[PDB]
Structure formats: C-alpha cells, structure tokens
Design a protein around this ligand. Structure first.
Ligand SMILES: Nc1nc2c(ncn2[C@@H]2O[C@H](COP(=O)(O)OP(=O)(O)O)[C@@H](O)[C@H]2O)c(=O)[nH]1
Ligand SMILES: Nc1nc2c(ncn2[C@@H]2O[C@H](COP(=O)(O)OP(=O)(O)O)[C@@H](O)[C@H]2O)c(=O)[nH]1
Ligand code: ALF
Ligand code: ALF
Ligand SMILES: [Mg+2]
Ligand SMILES: [Mg+2]
Lengths: 422, 412
C-alpha cells in the first residue's frame, strides 16, 4: 500500500543524510527508472497547511478519471502526515512511494513525483537547516509551490532569494535559468474585492508585487531581479481562508463538509491547474531533461556538495552584519597601524634601535586598538572580543616582519655595541 | 478635537523627518510636560491589525471607569486610521494628540502616550526603513506590543533581535537592560486546545518558545539570550481570530456586532491587562524616570543618530552575507599573497634582482586573484567586481612596500 517515504533526513546535530535505499526503491524501479520525470514540491513557512494541500494533490492524482475527484464529503484527509498544533510535523523531505504515470498530450508516459517538505523557520532548526531543505526541494522539483500565509511580504522575498541563491551556488554552472516553475500560493487571502481568488487575481497581484523598476531603491530591485532570474515560469494563486473549523477545531480530520465552500471551489481550480498533464513540464537540469534514475544521481550529488564543500552558509542578519562590521573595522585598524609603521621602518627608512622601534610599535598598536573599540558595530563588545584578539594578533605578526627588516639594515648593531662598550 | 498626529514622517526617498512643532505641541503643554510618562507602542509586520488594536486601546483609555468601555456594539471603530486592502496604511510613527492622565495605585499621577507604527516589511521599504521605525518605537516606548500573526516563528525572533540591536546601538551605553516591557501578541491564534487563549496560555507557550537549553544549537541559544537581555519584562497573549468578516468584508467598519464574541471576550481582558493603572510602567532611560519633556528630548536625539551615518546600517540577508563573504575572501587572498612574498623577500631573505621580484609578484598576485574568484560567495561576480578590484589595488600597495625593502638590502 502506497505511503509517505522519508528520503532526506535532518539529524539532531544538523547534519543531512539521504536515504538512498528508500530513494532507490522508489525511483530506480524498473517501471519508472528510465521514464522522464516531473517533480512537484511544496515549501515555505512551517505550520501553514503544506502537507494538507499535498494530500489533496494526492486525491487528484489517484482520481483524475472520476467525475468527483475531490471525494465524498465525509471522508478524512490522509497521505503525508498533517495536523494542527503549533509544533512542526513534517521534517526533512519525504516523497510519495507511488510514482504516477501520466500521458502528456504529446505521446508516451512520464513519471510524477510528489515531494513534501519540512516547513522553514521552526524553532528546532538553524537558518542553514531551513535553507538546505528549501534549496534541495527547489533544485529537485520542476514545479515549486511556494506556500505563504495571507500576503507576500518583503521578508518573504528576501528569504526566497537567500534560499534559491544557496541552491544555485551548489549547481552546475549554466547560462540558463537554474529552475523552472514557481507558484506563489497565498493561503488565507483576505481581499478578493481587490484581487480575485484564483490564478488571475493572483497573477495581477504578483505582477505588481514583483515588478522590477529602475527607479526603486537597489535593495527592492535586486531581490526582484534575482527571483525573476531564477525561474522560467512564475505564477501566483490566491486562496480563501478554509474557515475556522479547519483552522481551530481539534476534531477536524479533513472532511470537505467541514471546509468552507468557497475554499473548496477554489481548491478545485487550484489542483488541476497545478497538475494537469499539459502544465506538467519534465524536470531539466543544465539544459537536459532528466529521468527518474538521473534525478536520484542529482539528489546524491547535491547532498554531497552541502556536506563537503566550502559554501557560504546562511547567517541571521544580526550575525551577518556583526561579522561585516567587525571585519571592516579590523581592516581599517590594521591598515592604520601598517601605514604608520611604514613611515617609521619602511624599507627606505633608517635603522632604528630595537627599543625605539618597540616603543613606536606599542604606541601605534594601542592607537589601532583604541580606534577599533571606537567604531560602532552591531553585536556588542562581547561579539567583538574575538575580532579584537584577531586584530592584536595580526598586528603582532606585522611587527615581527618589521623587526626582521629593521635588523637586516644593521646586523652588527649589537656586536658593535658590545665591542664599543668595552 | 483629538486625533492621530504624524510625528515621524518617512519620505519617498527613504529619508526620515521629525515633526517637532507637532511633537512639542503635544508633549510640552503645561498640563503634561512635567509628568512622568508611560509610552505604549504597537509594532510588527504590516497589514496585521495594529491600528485596529490601538483604536480599541483608545476606547479603554477614554472609558476606563466603565464596565462597558468596549463600547456600543453598533459603533464604528475610529482613531488611528485602519483598513483592509493589501497596501499599507500607517507610515512612519503616529501618536494620539490627547495625552491621558492616570492615577497609579501609588498616588503617582502619570501621563500616557499612545504610539502607532508603520508595519514592517511592506514593499515600499528598505530593511533600514523598517528597522528604524521598529527601533525608534521600541527605544521611546515603555511598553512595546510586538504584534504577530498566528505563531512565533524563528524568523520573527531574528527580526526582533536585529531591530532591538539597531535600537540599542543608537542608545547611550548602559549598565542596565536597554528596554522595559515587551508583549508578544499572537493574532489569530489557532490552537486553544494546546495553549489557552489569553495571558496564561501565552505565558506557557512563550516560555517554551524562548527557553535556552545547553542542548540547543548556538544560533538558537543566542537569539534567545539577546531577547531576554533586552527587556525587563516579557509577556505573551494569545488572541482568537476576530472572524472572517473582519478580515474579508470591505464594508466592515469595526462594529463589535460583526466581531466574533470570543475575540471580544479576550480583547476585553487584553486591553486592561496591557493598560490598567497598575500595569502602566513609567518610562526609564539608563535608570532615570523620564517625563514628557524628557521624552521629546530623546525623540529628537535618537532620530538625529538615525539621520546620520555614524551607525552601521542593516542590509538584506543576501546583501549582508554577500558583503561578509567578499570581505573574507579579500583577506584570505591578500594574506596568501603576503605570506608567499614574505618567503621570497622577507627581512631575513637575500636581495632579489628587481626584475625577478617583479616576476614573482606578478605570479603571486595572479594566483591570489584566482584564489579570490574561486571562492563561492553570494551573490555573483557582479557584486564581487568591486572587491576584486580592491584586492588587486591593495596587493599593488603591498608590492610597493616590498620593493623598498628589497632595494635597501643592496644599500652598500
Ligand atoms: N488558516 C489556514 N489553515 C489551514 C489551511 N490549510 C490547512 N490548514 C490547517 O493548517 C494546519 C497545519 O497543516 P499542515 O499540512 O501539517 O501544515 P504544514 O506544517 O505546512 O505541513 C492544520 O491544522 C490544517 O487544518 C489554510 O489554507 N488556512
Ligand atoms: N485576520 C485578522 N485580521 C484583523 C485582526 N484585527 C484587525 N484585522 C483586520 O486587519 C486589517 C488591517 O488592519 P490595520 O489595523 O489597518 O492593520 P495594520 O497595518 O497592522 O495597522 C483590517 O481589515 C482589519 O479588519 C485580527 O486579529 N486578525
Ligand atoms: F510545520 Al510543517 F510540515 F511545515 F509540520
Ligand atoms: F500595513 Al500598516 F499600519 F502596518 F497599514
Ligand atoms: Mg507538512
Ligand atoms: Mg496601521
């Protein structure tokens, strides 16, 4: 009996491991291994109805032939595990064990994989944990449903940019756009009088929200240019609130009779719109169409990169900023010291007695330390102590080099001093 | 007639302006200027009902004596401008023109100021615009209501950390915690069966959300330690959804009869829990209780710090990481060059023919350029061309110094 399969595991020590046996058992099966593959993923903030949606997608895939694919109104919703409560349910990445075989209008059979993901920004996870799940799901999928709550805020665009950038960095260089299709799915859209529920209102809303203008602040332009540059297709669907029973009643178990009718009406537009054979494009990577076995090879490779390579890993903005402020201040303080020692013991300057040089070095070092402490930086003095230590250390190193140069100007200084003394 | 007054103006060019005439007119009046002041702000993500809430706070402040301060169920909600639609309404910072005079159980008569703020993360705003509004409201207020939707996610904690840190940086050094009271107000809380609506459920929920344990990753511990360190008091209230009509009906005008009764029930607890005379903490800055006159002075002083460039301004996560990656790569590439040259022309190494020195330098500089280009960084060569050129220039400076050392070895 078909069921959800855990394929990417995130360990408690925040390491990532792929379950190759489970992945192979699904995608290396003889019936599907050489078939071209379509992969549909959902991703976004945690506790926002992603798995719930995926389970409705499952009903469609299993019942496309039916006049009533949505089902009997008294049936519970099953598949990927979903529930209320404020703590996350889905972790890592899971896929449905049954690969669906679809006929494209074109010709023969292509395979469809459904991927469910750990929601971002749960309190068990580092930023890197969230970035990795999101990036990988994006890199694997041919269609990414980016699930949001109520609105598309500027912080949402920044996260999307950061996560997709993390993915792209791990990919083969290509002059083509790295990904294919992205859907901004807004749950609980509250203003149908302003933009209609569905894909057209959604398109109109997003066209405005994402428009790149040369006159906007660079920060607003750049997040928008990045998102447009990552995907060949970007669309948006506005969905109504499902009603307060879905949201708040602990006995709710997914029965349509307990879901707002306007939601159901739009759900019935949304799912076939996402999953119709004509809209389902075969996954491509670096200009090549990929098969099921080929998709497994990429999953392994992408995981290995995240495990083994120097990648710039995502940092919280305070952290990122605190690091930048500190590195900049170290550079300046060090440069000031060096320039001033150069005036004193650069190559075109006379030899200095070791004690005079030490005195000059100590003064200048102190001046650079005082300068470094003076610069306002995010993170506090506690965050800066390591950098202060680094600055004093690098200055001492510069001094050592200076001594060697200074000595070379008068090797006999001490020997001659001792002879003259007597 | 009382009304909302625009006090911090945020212009289209992302510049900030204080309306001093307006601010002075409110807080320097004879009746209030010498009163100790309580300042209540609400802040957080845009389009989440902050102004709506403030307007219910206003009904309470005008009718604290009544059992039915919440109002006639047919009366519309007025005050700070609030409305639906996907575009922001409130910009900058507004205050209510009428300062309320309240008697604390103490005997201490105090002034109460209400602050409404531009929601963060709207599509017109730089990160710096959102940080400035949030930081200023937090630096000025004695009670900050941090308004959130549905849940308290890790990204919410990170934004709070960035914003409050930006605030602390514009403040005078202090041996005390920088801020006083913070309330995490979760709108549309959906899980009363897990944690009850209200302050008690809220407290249990937040205690778990913010608890620091030795088993936590450092990144998670650190956001929490920072937040606990910023505020003298941290609380949390879980509020039910007000109903789909409040959210979706374009003709809804704030009448209680159109608001879910359970929301109303919890609202009626929430407001006096926030604003009752015992709950009103007098604003303190660096250990001194502040008056209305004093608060005006800090408002001007704080804004002036934000108006200038004497502080490091926050950048988007990609941009900030991009700069960090780049500064780090400049350093590594430079140090690599320097160390190898040192091996070749350090003080304890023999004179090299000037042309040979040039040749070795050109090689080692090129190797450092490749090293720099080789390092993966967010985001793109485009962002890095500035840093690459900087790297090459600095290497050229180092070389100039090496030539002078090498030459001096042949001074004979
Ligand atoms: N407000 C709202 N709640 C939803 C929606 N769809 C599902 N839910 C509820 O969201 C909760 C979390 O569902 P789940 O699929 O596990 O969220 P996930 O963590 O993103 O996978 C469940 O209680 C669902 O009943 C929606 O569109 N709006
Ligand atoms: N979902 C929801 N909507 C609310 C709530 N309170 C107010 N609203 C609606 O939120 C919208 C925005 O209100 P407003 O106060 O102007 O938002 P602000 O931008 O945060 O100041 C209005 O349509 C209100 O009716 C709430 O608790 N939950
Ligand atoms: F909170 Al989830 F899948 F995002 F359980
Ligand atoms: F979107 Al607002 F006040 F935060 F109108
Ligand atoms: Mg899930
Ligand atoms: Mg407002």
């Amino acid at each position: 009996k078909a069921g959800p399969v855990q394929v990417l595991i995130v360990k408690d020590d925040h390491s990532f491991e792929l379950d190759e046996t489970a992945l192979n058992r699904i995608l290396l099966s003889e019936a599907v291994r050489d078939k071209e593959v379509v992969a549909v993923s959902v991703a976004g903030a945690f506790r926002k109805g992603k798995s719930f949606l995926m389970d409705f997608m499952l009903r469609y895939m299993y019942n496309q032939e039916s006049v009533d694919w949505v089902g009997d109104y008294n049936e519970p919703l099953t598949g990927f595990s979903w529930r209320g409560g404020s703590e996350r349910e889905t972790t890592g990445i899971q896929i449905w064990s049954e690969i669906f075989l679809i006929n494209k209008p074109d010709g023969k059979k292509v395979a469809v994989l459904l991927m469910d993901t750990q929601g971002t920004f749960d309190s068990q996870s580092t930023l890197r944990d969230s970035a990795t799940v999101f990036a990988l799901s994006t890199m694997i999928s041919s269609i990414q449903v980016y699930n949001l709550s109520q609105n598309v805020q500027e912080d949402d665009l920044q996260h999307l940019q950061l996560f997709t950038e993390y993915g792209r960095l791990a990919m083969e260089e290509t002059f083509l756009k790295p990904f294919q299709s992205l859907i901004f799915l807004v749950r609980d859209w509250s203003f149908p009088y302003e933009f209609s529920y569905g894909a057209d209102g959604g398109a109109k809303f997003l066209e405005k929200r994402l428009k790149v203008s040369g006159n906007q602040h660079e920060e607003l332009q750049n997040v928008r240019k990045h998102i447009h540059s990552c995907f060949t297709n970007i669309s948006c669907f506005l969905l109504p609130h499902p009603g307060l029973k879905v949201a708040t009643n602990p006995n709710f178990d997914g029965k349509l009779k307990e879901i707002d009718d306007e939601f159901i009406k739009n759900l019935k537009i949304l799912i076939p719109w996402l999953l119709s054979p004509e809209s389902l494009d075969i996954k491509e990577i670096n200009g090549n169409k990929i098969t099921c076995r080929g998709l497994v090879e990429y999953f392994k490779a992408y995981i290995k990169i995240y495990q083994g390579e120097e990648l710039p890993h995502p940092k919280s903005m305070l952290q990122a900023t605190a690091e930048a402020n500190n590195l900049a201040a170290v550079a300046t303080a060090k440069d000031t010291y060096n320039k001033k020692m150069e005036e004193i013991c650069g190559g075109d300057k006379p030899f200095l007695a070791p004690n005079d040089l030490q005195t000059k070095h100590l003064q200048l070092k102190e001046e650079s330390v005082k300068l470094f402490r003076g610069v306002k930086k995010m993170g506090g003095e506690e965050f800066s102590r390591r950098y202060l230590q680094q600055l004093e250390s690098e200055i001492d190193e510069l001094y050592i080099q200076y001594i060697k140069h200074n000595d070379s100007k008068n090797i006999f200084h001490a020997a001659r001093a001792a002879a003259l003394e007597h």
